[PDB]
Design a protein around this ligand. Structure first.
Ligand code: VT3
Ligand code: ZN
Lengths: 47, 161
């Protein structure tokens, strides 16, 4: 993996074109996330 | 040392996790190419992932970050979709689970939009879709996503398309 930018712990990707998109985030150390919930699902065909 | 505990659909915790999953679906610029065409999900199961060693690894690092950032971990709950979901819940996140070609460099990527994470369930770009039908928009096969506790600390802001 790469390193966080100097003086930072993560990167935030702010949406700058699509006004409906929410943010995306990147961490560079696996210890900074815990997989708390496992969700099993199907996508549903629109009617 | 991981165990999976099923939540009941009547449990408040099941219901608040389902609502975050459903309410963060959006349309994608690929018209559904990577993750399929859908406005909502059929939730089949929600399980709590319990591993004492992995939790202590997380909290140890959270405390380091917080102490570097005026006692503020900047902790969020975010989605992650991956072909490696089964390894992640048993061994934790590490360098093997990074998106090497991501536009913010090789790191582990998380989304506010559950539908963004759904694009990676079957691999980068949806890979070849489900293993059974080779269909990125399969409505039959069961998918899995993680809803994760993530320490951001001081985050670098990238404005981007
Ligand atoms: C091998 C691999 C590659 C990308 C992902 C992934 N990428 C994301 C992204 O680029 C933005 C927002 C979320 C994700 C994500 O959930 N998984 C997971 C595993
Ligand atoms: Zn299928």
């Amino acid at each position: 993996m790469a390193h966080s930018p100097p003086g930072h712990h993560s990167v935030t990707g702010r949406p700058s074109v699509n006004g409906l998109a929410l943010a995306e985030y990147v961490i560079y150390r696996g210890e900074q996330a815990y997989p708390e919930y496992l969700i099993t699902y199907q996508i549903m065909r629109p009617e | 040392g991981t165990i999976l505990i099923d939540l009941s659909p009547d449990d408040k915790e099941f219901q608040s996790v389902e609502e975050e999953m459903q309410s963060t679906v959006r349309e994608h610029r690929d018209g559904g190419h990577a993750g399929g065409i859908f406005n909502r999900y059929n939730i089949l199961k929600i399980q709590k992932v319990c591993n004492k060693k992995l939790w202590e690894r997380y909290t140890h690092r959270r405390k380091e970050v917080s102490e570097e950032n005026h006692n503020h971990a900047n902790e969020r709950m975010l989605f992650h979709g991956s072909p490696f979901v089964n390894a992640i819940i048993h061994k934790g996140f590490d360098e093997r689970h990074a998106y090497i070609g991501g536009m913010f460099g090789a790191g582990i990527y998380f989304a506010e939009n559950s539908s963004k994470s759904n694009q990676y369930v079957y691999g980068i770009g949806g890979g070849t879709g489900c293993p059974v039908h080779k269909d990125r928009s399969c409505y039959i096969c069961h998918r899995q996503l993680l809803f994760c506790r993530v320490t951001l600390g001081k985050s670098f802001l990238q404005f981007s398309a």
